[PDB]
Amino acid sequence: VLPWSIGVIIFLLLIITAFMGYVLVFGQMSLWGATVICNLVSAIPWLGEDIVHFLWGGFSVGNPTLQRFFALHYLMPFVLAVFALLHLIALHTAGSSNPLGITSNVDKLSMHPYYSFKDLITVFAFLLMFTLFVFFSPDKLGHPDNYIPANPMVTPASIVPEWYLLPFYAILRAIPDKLGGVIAMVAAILILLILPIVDRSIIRGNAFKPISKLLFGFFICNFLLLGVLGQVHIEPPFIVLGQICTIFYFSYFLILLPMVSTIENIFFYIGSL
Amino acid sequence: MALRKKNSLLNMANSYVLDSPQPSNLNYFWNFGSLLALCLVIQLATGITLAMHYT
Amino acid sequence: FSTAEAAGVKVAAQDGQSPISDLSVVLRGGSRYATVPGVSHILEKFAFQNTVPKSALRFVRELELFGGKLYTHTTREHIVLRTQFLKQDLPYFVDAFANVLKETKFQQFELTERVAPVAELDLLKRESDPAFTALEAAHEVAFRTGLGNSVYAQGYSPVTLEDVKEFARQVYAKQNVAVVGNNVVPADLQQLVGTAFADLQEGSKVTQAGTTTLHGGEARVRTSTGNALTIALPIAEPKPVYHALASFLGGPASMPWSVGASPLAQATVGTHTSVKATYHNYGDAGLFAITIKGDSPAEISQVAHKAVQALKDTGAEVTEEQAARAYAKSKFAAAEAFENPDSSASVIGMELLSGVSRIAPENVQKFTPAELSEAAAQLSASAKPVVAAVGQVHALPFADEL
Amino acid sequence: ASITSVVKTSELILKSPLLSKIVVPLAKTYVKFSGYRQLGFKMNDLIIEETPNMQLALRRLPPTESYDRVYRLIRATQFSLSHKLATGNDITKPEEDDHYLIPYILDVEAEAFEKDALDNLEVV
Amino acid sequence: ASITSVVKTSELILKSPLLSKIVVPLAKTYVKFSGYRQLGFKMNDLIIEETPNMQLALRRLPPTESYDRVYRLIRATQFSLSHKLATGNDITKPEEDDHYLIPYILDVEAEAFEKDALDNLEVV
Amino acid sequence: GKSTYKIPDFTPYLKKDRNTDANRLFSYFMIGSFGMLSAAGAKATVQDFLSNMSASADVLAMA
Amino acid sequence: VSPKTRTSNLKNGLTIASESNPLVQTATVGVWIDAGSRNENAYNNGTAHFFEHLAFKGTDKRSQHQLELDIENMGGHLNAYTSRESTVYYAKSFKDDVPKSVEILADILQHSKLAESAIDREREVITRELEEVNKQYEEVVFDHLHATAFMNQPLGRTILGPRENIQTITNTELRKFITENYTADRMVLVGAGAVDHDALVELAEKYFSHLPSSQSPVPLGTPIPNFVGSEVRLRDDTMPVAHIAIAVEGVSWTSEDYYTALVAQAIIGNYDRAVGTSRHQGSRLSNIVSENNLANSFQSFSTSYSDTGLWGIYLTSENTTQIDDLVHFTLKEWNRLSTSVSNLQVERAKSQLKAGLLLSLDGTTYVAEDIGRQLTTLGRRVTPAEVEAKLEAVTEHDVRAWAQKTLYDKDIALVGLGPIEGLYDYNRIRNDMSMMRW
Ligand code: HEM
Ligand code: HEM
Ligand SMILES: CCCCCCCCCCCCO[C@@H]1O[C@H](CO)[C@@H](O[C@H]2O[C@H](CO)[C@@H](O)[C@H](O)[C@H]2O)[C@H](O)[C@H]1O
Ligand SMILES: CCCCCCCCCCCCO[C@@H]1O[C@H](CO)[C@@H](O[C@H]2O[C@H](CO)[C@@H](O)[C@H](O)[C@H]2O)[C@H](O)[C@H]1O
């Protein structure tokens, strides 16, 4: 539980780091994405507006905001490296889990040379993917509007986050209330912290659980659909679709996984009697 | 077992700032190490803040 | 103690005027009846473990709510399980004994984790006294099997769960069970035992494998934890005169910071040793023992020679004063044995199980100087003397020296 | 979930004729598609063991059961890393899939749960 | 420097009449101004102990010497932290400043140095 | 000197009223005052320092 | 319902107190004195203990040998013990050997020879015992505990006394001590078992009538102790077992919190790994200690004196690296007496004590000890009904109130003996006497 819980914080720190780094270009998407995302803080009751002006260092996103985002963007990766190390120190008490979900205390292998050399394979696979983007298609994953200098007057046609934030944006849009939407979006990440509780299985992991595997597959594909819905226009029928997908996202943690894991426990016991 | 000893993360902090066994007769010249830690913390806090306003 | 019978179980109770009752189950299951070495000790330690109606844990938590206490011990003849509680809580305690005798789940994990570790600490605590060891070794030499079996479980002879389960099948049976209630209304106990122990098997009387045989010899036990020496004499015809003889010979003091007027107490003069004459009536056989503990092995050697001489001197002739002292001290010994619940339980237990009618302290016989001297003479001239040395055994006496 | 919970709920179902008629066939197909028997495991080999209760129950296993469990874990680990399935005698047959561990863990948990209840008793 | 070196060089000096006449008075003044005796130490209590050789020599001390050394270290530590000096019987008198440890460490080092030499022997 | 049951002399240091509430209260007054000044000093420090992030004078001039 | 304790006085002021039992055939008769080592100064410290030796060294009439013979002829035994505030001299005999044993006691108390030769012979004996008490670890720990808790006070002195006093105690000092302290108004003749009260009163009139009365007769159990938070460390790395006692100032015999302190003590309770039932006890500390193997044993105590007491725990442990855990969890259980105890723990402990207080009185000696103790400390034998009522009046509110004034954030006296490197300094132990979360 502890390496997983520190992992959830690592993920939040990654999001903040990448958000601030994207603003630094100060193109159209940089400015307008900063404006919309920082105005979510205005939803905090009573003090929200004051907090936003304090974050910006002024009354809109401008020079003070950019200079502070640079300093924090430089810092946050160092913080993230510390938490990455912490989650591995926490893991080192139990060791790595494994795909069967059983103990490995019966049969251990040294990290080197076995996993050192196994890691090199994917290092080179990664470098090949990296090569194809950086050298042959360096702008495929970006937004053309970020090659226009920031202009507070002109509003871009569509303000969307970077692709990796899109599912969280779709969850926010699903709730009509401003504060509601903010809470849901944060909750969508913080709810990962309750997996250790809502999973009622007596067995670790899904390798041997056909129904859990099907549910997991639906959960993953729903998360990708939320990502796609994060960058469509707010139009029919995507509005209702985004709400159904949002409900399914939360019901995986709150209803489906606890039900399915309970029933599978019974099926394993009765099935093997 | 006390949590400070049982939990591996807490135990690392415990080992340096709490249960760490020290000689009983250190004089005030053993205080410079923590003053250096204080200078470092001030430089990080002030330096990162200056970086928010410096060009 | 009014002896009666309730559903085939012998029940003896004596009402009193006190808020505290003692209920004891005496079992014919002591070490002389043991099938495997140590099983009677392990069975004793298995009492009040998990039963089918009530776990060990639940029993202890409830016992605390009644403020009751539990005492158990093993002898060569019996296992004694005793509870002490407030008078009114009698039905709970009768039912708890019934659960133990009928429904003990003898689980392997209890043996490994609970019972055997406790049995091992029990023995180590007793052995801290080298006199305990010396007197145990003397029984082993003198009787070999039966009375010569160890009372306690040892590491060298492991008791298995199947051993303990088999022995319990024999022992926990109406034929081997006696109930003794101190400060218990006799009619109330009979009614309760009659309902609770009705479904206990009848079983059969556990018997000693083999007849009691008497032997002589030596047992040198090297310890580094202090020095003792037992000079024991196995008796084929246990007589009550040996009780008076032990009391006469003596060994301990009857006042603080003193040696004592007893022959054996006057054998320790000038040393830091302690003597103790002890007669062990065992029905078919007996053992008269003179245990001398001390720090210095040379000091023990000295007292040991004076001890043997004292016995010979007694055998020659004793005076009327000495005879009166023997009787007075023996009557007192009988009185306090019938008082202490530990020994009280076993005394009536022997009357109920075996048949040996108890000798009331007021009926302790007065032995003439002639009868005492004759008893000592019969011991000094024994063909099978036992000597058990414990400690620095190279520096302790041998049988042929004594 | 506690093994106790799973065992008791299953027993409620097995009691009900209707329920058993519909649940037992589903449970048997579930176990077939689970495919743990194709790595030579018994069902109880999959139970999470990193808890005090389970470590206690594993220490109470008879030595032979304990040595055989070690072998089945090592053998399954070797099939997993090789991406192979058991064949022949290595496949667990339905008659070999015995609940060797369930009785030990039920006793450990019975004590643990009684201890919790008794820690909260109120003298009336 | 090795204790061996110090002891041998000192012995060279004590042999030479001239050298001893000039060095022994300086060494005695040095020891007076050093002031370790005012914390109740003996000179050998100050020798660096965190070496394999010294840990071996300390293990070879007779138990009595070893227990007394422990007490003198604890007592000096208490004077140090209090900023006090020994008074009365706590002050080490010159006649009490015995080289209790030197013989043990010289034997440890003799073996260690012989081992090093013999590791480099050449059959002729 | 030899008997360990004869406690060394602590009379130069011992307070007569060591068991009283007044005695304990005094030392908690010192600890409390120190905690109080540390809380007030932390609050001042945090407030003054973090105010750097609020609009600077040149930003407020153009508002 | 036990028989009533009968009580009579003589003219000099000697109390006679008896509790008959028809079932037994043996009777304990003895003299409980409200005097002990506390009544000595620093110059005669050890006199009371010295007298106990000389009481059995010969009287005005009978020699030591004759004394031995006489007791042996009765068939029973004589026994004596001296504590800080109480001295006892009893004689367990047969029913019919009660009068003769009474005669022997009156003689050794009123007319002991105290021969100079006998004094010199005992000097060596007592000197040997001084360098032999070391073996009894529990006694060492408790003697140091009193010495430190009542630093430089009469309750902080040892019973045996210092070596220096042992070499200088004279027959004059001995005579003075027993003349000042063994007075009739401070003495109770106690009978338990097969005794007739009326017979015992007659024997008292025959033997103890010429006892001096004190000049100022105060009531029995009449006493200012100033507890010192402090520690004694007796580190011995060669011992395998650490022995640690921790105590706060507790309650006197007549405190209004006497029963509340006993209930609080019972909530923590005792533990011993050698007893089979101990792993199943209800006590929270017992569960922590047994599950983690932190100790071989612990024993809670609440020791009382006329004007003070010590309440605490005595632990023994071989787990030298987790001594910190043992002490930590012990003091966290004490904290709960002030912060968390509810009706549950309190009612459980009261249930246990209701029986325990009666259970203690087993044999005739146990009964005699109870009568004697209660008569010399309270001035009366408290009936079981009164004790049951006082226990019933203890509420959870009383325990919490008592703990908050007596334990919470209080100075402790701490003694450690053996491999105690793992025992932290005073501050870290004393910091566990409160919880920052509360
Ligand atoms: C950022 C700079 C530094 C920090 C924060 C720091 C911190 C500390 C601390 C906290 C200690 C233990 C407490 C003490 O003795 O003061 C310590 C000890 C030590 N430091 Fe530093 N230090 C720093 C720089 C240095 C430098 C430059 C050196 C050496 C050239 C050094 C060498 C040591 C040594 C040898 C010790 C052990 C000293 C001893 O206890 O005897 N440190 N340091
Ligand atoms: C060991 C830690 C550090 C030391 C010794 C240090 C030292 C210095 C010094 C000597 C200056 C010149 C100051 C002046 O005269 O104006 C300076 C300036 C600066 N430092 Fe640092 N520094 C440290 C850490 C940092 C950190 C962590 C940052 C984070 C960015 C930082 C940011 C700055 C900036 C922006 C300036 C220029 C503005 C100014 O002069 O004040 N420093 N530093
Ligand atoms: C701002 C810094 C970022 C976070 C880093 C935290 C402090 C640094 C810890 C890394 C060092 C860990 O390396 C290791 O840790 C263990 C775990 O406590 C510690 O172990 C130490 O304490 C434990 C118990 O407290 C003892 O049993 C052990 O004998 C001793 O060596 C030591 O410190 C070190 O041997
Ligand atoms: C981890 C912390 C999380 C939450 C903490 C929130 C703190 C951030 C709020 C910054 C508040 C600044 O609030 C403002 O501060 C300055 C001092 O800084 C005050 O200014 C006042 O004192 C300063 C000096 O200290 C003078 O220059 C000034 O004339 C006077 O008005 C204002 O009266 C106050 O309104």
Author numbering:
A (entry chain C): 111 to 383
B (entry chain N): 1 to 55
C (entry chain M): 15 to 416
D (entry chain G), E (entry chain R): 2 to 125
F (entry chain P): 39 to 101
G (entry chain L): 26 to 248, 260 to 474
Give the published text.
The cytochrome bc 1 complex, also known as respiratory complex III (CIII), in the electron-transfer chain of the inner mitochondrial membrane is a homodimer (CIII2) of two biochemically identical protomers. CIII2 catalyses the transfer of electrons from the lipophilic two-electron donor ubiquinol (QH2) to the water-soluble, one-electron acceptor protein cytochrome c, contributing to an electrochemical proton gradient across the membrane. Electron transfer within the complex occurs through the prosthetic groups of the three catalytic core subunits: heme b L and heme b H of cytochrome b (cyt b), heme c 1 of cytochrome c 1 (cyt c 1) and the [2Fe–2S] cluster of the iron–sulfur protein (ISP), often called the Rieske protein after its discoverer. The Rieske domain is tethered to the complex by one transmembrane helix and a connecting flexible linker that acts as a hinge.
(vii) +DQH2+antimycin A: with DQH2 and antimycin A. When antimycin A was added with DQH2, the Rieske domain did not occupy the b position. Also, increased heterogeneity was not observed in cyt b when antimycin A was added in combination with atovaquone or decylubiquinol.
